Amino acid sequence: SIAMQTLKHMPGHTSREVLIIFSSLTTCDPSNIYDLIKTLKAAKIRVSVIGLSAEVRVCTVLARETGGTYHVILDESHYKELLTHHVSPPPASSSSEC
Amino acid sequence: MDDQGCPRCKTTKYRNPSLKLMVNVCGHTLCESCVDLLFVRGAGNCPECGTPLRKSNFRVQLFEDPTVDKEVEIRKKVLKIYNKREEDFPSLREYNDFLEEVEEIVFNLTNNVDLDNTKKKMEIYQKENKDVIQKNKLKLTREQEELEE
Amino acid sequence: MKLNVDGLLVYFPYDYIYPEQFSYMRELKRTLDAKGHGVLEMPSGTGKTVSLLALIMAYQRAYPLEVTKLIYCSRTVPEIEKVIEELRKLLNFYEKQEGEKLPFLGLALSSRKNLCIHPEVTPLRFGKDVDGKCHSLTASYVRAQYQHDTSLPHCRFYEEFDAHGREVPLPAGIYNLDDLKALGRRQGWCPYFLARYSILHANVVVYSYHYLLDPKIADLVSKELARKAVVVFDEAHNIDNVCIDSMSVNLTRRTLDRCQGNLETLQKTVLRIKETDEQRLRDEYRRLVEGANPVLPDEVLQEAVPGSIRTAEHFLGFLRRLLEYVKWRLRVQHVVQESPPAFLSGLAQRVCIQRKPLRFCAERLRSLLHTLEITDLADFSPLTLLANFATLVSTYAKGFTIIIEPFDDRTPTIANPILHFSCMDASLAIKPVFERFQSVIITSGTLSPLDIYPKILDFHPVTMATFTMTLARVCLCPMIIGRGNDQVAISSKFETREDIAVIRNYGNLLLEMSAVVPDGIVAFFTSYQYMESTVASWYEQGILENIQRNKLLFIETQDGAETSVALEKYQEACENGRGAILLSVARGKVSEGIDFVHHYGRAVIMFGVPYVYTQSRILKARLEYLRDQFQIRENDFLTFDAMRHAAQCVGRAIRGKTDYGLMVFADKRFARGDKRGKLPRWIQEHLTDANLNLTVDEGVQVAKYFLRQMAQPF
Ligand code: SF4
Ligand SMILES: [Zn+2]
Numbered sequence: 001s002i003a004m005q006t007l008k009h010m011p012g013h014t015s016r017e018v019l020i021i022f023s024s025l026t027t028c029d030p031s032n033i034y035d036l037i038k039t040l041k042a043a044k045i046r047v048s049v050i051g052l053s054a055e056v057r058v059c060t061v062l063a064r065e066t067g068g069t070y071h072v073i074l075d076e077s078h079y080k081e082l083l084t085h086h087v088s089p090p091p092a093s094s095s096s097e098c
Numbered sequence: 099m100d101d102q103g104c105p106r107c108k109t110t111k112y113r114n115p116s117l118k119l120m121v122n123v124c125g126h127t128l129c130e131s132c133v134d135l136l137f138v139r140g141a142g143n144c145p146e147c148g149t150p151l152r153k154s155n156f157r158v159q160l161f162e163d164p165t166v167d168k169e170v171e172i173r174k175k176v177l178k179i180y181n182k183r184e185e186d187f188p189s190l191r192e193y194n195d196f197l198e199e200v201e202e203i204v205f206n207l208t209n210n211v212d213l214d215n216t217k218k219k220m221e222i223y224q225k226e227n228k229d230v231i232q233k234n235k236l237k238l239t240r241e242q243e244e245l246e247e
Numbered sequence: 248m249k250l251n252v253d254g255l256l257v258y259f260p261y262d263y264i265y266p267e268q269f270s271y272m273r274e275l276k277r278t279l280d281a282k283g284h285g286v287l288e289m290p291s292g293t294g295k296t297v298s299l300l301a302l303i304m305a306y307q308r309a310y311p312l313e314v315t316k317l318i319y320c321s322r323t324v325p326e327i328e329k330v331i332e333e334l335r336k337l338l339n340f341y342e343k344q345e346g347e348k349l350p351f352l353g354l355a356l357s358s359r360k361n362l363c364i365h366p367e368v369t370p371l372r373f374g375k376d377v378d379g380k381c382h383s384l385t386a387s388y389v390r391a392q393y394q395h396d397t398s399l400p401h402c403r404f405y406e407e408f409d410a411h412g413r414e415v416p417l418p419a420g421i422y423n424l425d426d427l428k429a430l431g432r433r434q435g436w437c438p439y440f441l442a443r444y445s446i447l448h449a450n451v452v453v454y455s456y457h458y459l460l461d462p463k464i465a466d467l468v469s470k471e472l473a474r475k476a477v478v479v480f481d482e483a484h485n486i487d488n489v490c491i492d493s494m495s496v497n498l499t500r501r502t503l504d505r506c507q508g509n510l511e512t513l514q515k516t517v518l519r520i521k522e523t524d525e526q527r528l529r530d531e532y533r534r535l536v537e538g539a540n541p542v543l544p545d546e547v548l549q550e551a552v553p554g555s556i557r558t559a560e561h562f563l564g565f566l567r568r569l570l571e572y573v574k575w576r577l578r579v580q581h582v583v584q585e586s587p588p589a590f591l592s593g594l595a596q597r598v599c600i601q602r603k604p605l606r607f608c609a610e611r612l613r614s615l616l617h618t619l620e621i622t623d624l625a626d627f628s629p630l631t632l633l634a635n636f637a638t639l640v641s642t643y644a645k646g647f648t649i650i651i652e653p654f655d656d657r658t659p660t661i662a663n664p665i666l667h668f669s670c671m672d673a674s675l676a677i678k679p680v681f682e683r684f685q686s687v688i689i690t691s692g693t694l695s696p697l698d699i700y701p702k703i704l705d706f707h708p709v710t711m712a713t714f715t716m717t718l719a720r721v722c723l724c725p726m727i728i729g730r731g732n733d734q735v736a737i738s739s740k741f742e743t744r745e746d747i748a749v750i751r752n753y754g755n756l757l758l759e760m761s762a763v764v765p766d767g768i769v770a771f772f773t774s775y776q777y778m779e780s781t782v783a784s785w786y787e788q789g790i791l792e793n794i795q796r797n798k799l800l801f802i803e804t805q806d807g808a809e810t811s812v813a814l815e816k817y818q819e820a821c822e823n824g825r826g827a828i829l830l831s832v833a834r835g836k837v838s839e840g841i842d843f844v845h846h847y848g849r850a851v852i853m854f855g856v857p858y859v860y861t862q863s864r865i866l867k868a869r870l871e872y873l874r875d876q877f878q879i880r881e882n883d884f885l886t887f888d889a890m891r892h893a894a895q896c897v898g899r900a901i902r903g904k905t906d907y908g909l910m911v912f913a914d915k916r917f918a919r920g921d922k923r924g925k926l927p928r929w930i931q932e933h934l935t936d937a938n939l940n941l942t943v944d945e946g947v948q949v950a951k952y953f954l955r956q957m958a959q960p961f
């Protein structure tokens with residue numbers, strides 16, 4: 001929600017992206033996150049989680065539904081690879097506009 | 099023992115259930131502590147009904163239903179008659195027809211006058227007592243002894 | 248995907264099949280070719296159904312005369328719905344391949360309560376209520392009165408079906424239960440009776456066991472028409488228990504009192520009938536002289552003559568006598584008594600009730616009660632239960648036993664004693680299925696070793712093969728933890744149950760496992776009392792609060808409403824990131840009914856080997872009789888009863904679609920060779936000695952690493 005509030009007023013041309021480095025599999029939230037997923041899809045904010053030591057289901061659906069990618073750290077060397085991969089700009093999909 | 103108690107006296111049965119029903123020609127609930135009550139005065143008379151009893155007409159039973167008490171006792175006496183085995187009759191219907199008449203006799207004796215039943219039973223006595231009653235009566239002990247083991 | 252099976256060519260809808268599927272199809276075809284009953288096990292909850300159905304369809308096409316039809320039975324209606332979905336997909340695939348419709352029919356039967364279109368019976372949900380109401384509406388009396396067309400609610404759907412469906416059968420198609428309700432509404436016919444008639448001409452019929460095992464209702468629809476049909480039972484490893492339940496009848500004091508009251512109503516109704524209509528209803532006596540459903544199977548059932556009970560009064564007196572005998576025999580306070588033949592002999596001696604007249608008691612009850620034009624059978628149902636018991640006991644006691652419990656368990660003194668008539672061997676009740684049908688395939692998942700099943704159920708199997716799931720990835724990584732952080736034996740023995748250290752080890756293991764495991768976890772205990780004791784000890788200590796912090800915790804209770812609400816919330820917890828830890832009992836109906844899939848019950852935890860209490864006397868008859876006959880050791884059968892149950896309650900996570908998941912058994916007993924051997928092959932072969940007896944910490948670490956491996960894509 002904080003990221004959405006800041007990114008809502010961002011220009012349409014630029015690609016809004018979020019990389020959640022998830023560590024604790026639990027997610028205690030005041031409101032259901034599935035509802036927030038709808039707003040994220042409407043706002044075309046790409047969310048690509050990187051889980052740690054856990055294949056979290058809610059973040060699996062978050063990544064695939066919102067268009068981002070989900071991954072889990074095999075080890076530190078693979079962690080470097082994952083973040084370096086996310087460095088590069090992501091391809092623009094049909095929802096993306098220029 | 100689940101009965102609330104005697105039509106007369108229920109203190110004993112409410113508390114401890116050792117007392118057992120006593121069967122009578124009245125088909126009529128009674129309890130030992132009240133059997134003494136009947137022995138002292140009348141000596142074989144139902145308290146409310148006043149039905150006469152030859153010698154106390156008392157035998158231990160444990161069936162709360164008085165109708166069942168009378169029905170079972172009457173059936174016990176009836177079984178002494180018409181005890182011929184089924185295989186004695188090759189006819190398919192005759193296997194259970196006579197049992198139908200036996201059940202009719204039991205029900206007739208329970209409520210309706212037993213004069214006709216007694217006269218009929220005398221007729222059946224004169225014929226069955228010669229062979230069938232004696233044979234089945236003797237074979238009852240044999241079959242029971244084999245069945246028990 | 249056409250597979251060139253050894254026997255023939257078999258179509259298949261999905262693109263690829265694992266080698267276990269090839270082995271399954273070839274073994275199944277071998278059994279079908281031998282035309283002999285057999286048993287086989289397949290790991291996957293889903294996939295086996297499609298392979299089995301496709302192979303049966305192809306075999307039907309190749310040798311239509313060999314197999315008349317397929318009778319595929321499933322545990323529960325919610326489960327059999329998924330089977331009809333699979334069959335519909337297969338039929339659409341085959342129809343597209345052929346380019347045209349073929350004379351193939353497939354349908355599922357279900358209770359009138361589950362499916363019906365009459366608004367009056369819609370609001371009520373009780374099965375007995377629906378049965379009684381439908382019997383009233385469809386009663387021969389209601390039908391004859393409908394011919395008169397008098398002002399009275401008559402159920403038009405059955406009448407219209409009689410007029411139309413009798414003339415025209417449904418051409419073909421696949422109809423789910425829900426869709427069949429819509430068809431019945433549209434055509435003004437019964438979704439129930441229409442399917443019942445289609446059973447005569449249906450290629451595939453699917454219904455639960457109680458539609459095919461209990462002689463009361465199974466026989467009528469499983470008549471000899473299917474002389475040579477492929478009957479298949481799916482996931483029917485708990486077949487002995489259900490087959491026993493189909494025979495066991497429980498008599499209680501409250502039920503007996505209700506029976507007495509109902510009998511009083513019966514007598515009053517008979518008097519009213521005599522004063523109102525006597526001759527027309529007396530014609531029943533004539534037809535009786537010539538000579539709720541009977542519980543006697545095909546050959547055991549007899550219909551020579553009703554016996555000495557030829558009139559309403561005589562039969563009512565007979566029921567009074569038998570009910571009095573049962574009432575007193577139950578009121579006796581004493582140790583548990585067993586008396587299979589002696590009970591019949593004592594009944595006959597004490598109350599003068601011959602076994603032959605007692606044999607036809609229930610059948611004559613059905614006929615005589617029909618004569619009375621009663622409002623419904625729901626009110627008199629307890630009397631019918633007692634009548635079924637009355638006829639069964641006089642029918643046979645060679646492989647049965649009457650157990651009397653003046654005192655119930657869990658109560659030092661209770662005024663509601665119960666008389667059980669539990670069976671001891673399931674072969675008696677399942678004999679007609681094997682004998683009538685040319686071949687029966689008991690396909691099961693999580694099946695404990697097949698060798699016992701022929702001993703329990705008297706049949707000569709053709710094939711005995713265990714199929715191991717093979718995938719490019721190790722979907723399942725089971726483990727057994729017997730040593731805690733204290734290196735202390737953690738066996739959940741009866742004498743070791745009270746041990747606070749063992750309870751603490753279980754709590755700590757659950758805490759760490761919930762910390763590392765992703766959302767969704769289910770823990771199965773051995774009993775409600777044991778689960779409550781462990782929960783209370785954890786509550787007294789701080790372990791439970793920490794588990795609550797780490798993840799949400801839900802618990803199971805005997806009450807179905809609370810169970811349903813808790814599970815409904817558990818699913819939402821699994822969907823969200825909170826996660827959930829569902830504590831349940833292995834024997835709990837929730838464990839058997841529920842199915843765990845991807846992101847549901849990710850890590851299945853088994854707290855203690857599931858063993859039934861060694862005091863329930865019913866199991867004593869069931870067990871010692873198996874020792875005497877079929878020569879099964881008491882310990883052997885007991886451990887089998889534990890391993891089969893545990894495999895049932897731990898085999899859910901591998902449902903289908905290759906969804907990862909780990910099965911952890913927190914009991915050193917599972918580490919014993921006998922338990923491992925009796926464990927299903929597919930799980931055991933994955934299990935290895937390296938992880939056989941991991942400590943709590945070591946198991947947690949390996950679980951974390953395995954979850955890491957499964958997280959990444961193929
Ligand atoms: S006759 Fe058919 S429609 Fe009427 S209550 Fe019975 S099942 Fe329902
Ligand atoms: Zn008295």
Ligand SMILES: [Zn+2]
Nearest residue numbers: 124126144147
């Ligand atoms: Zn009297």
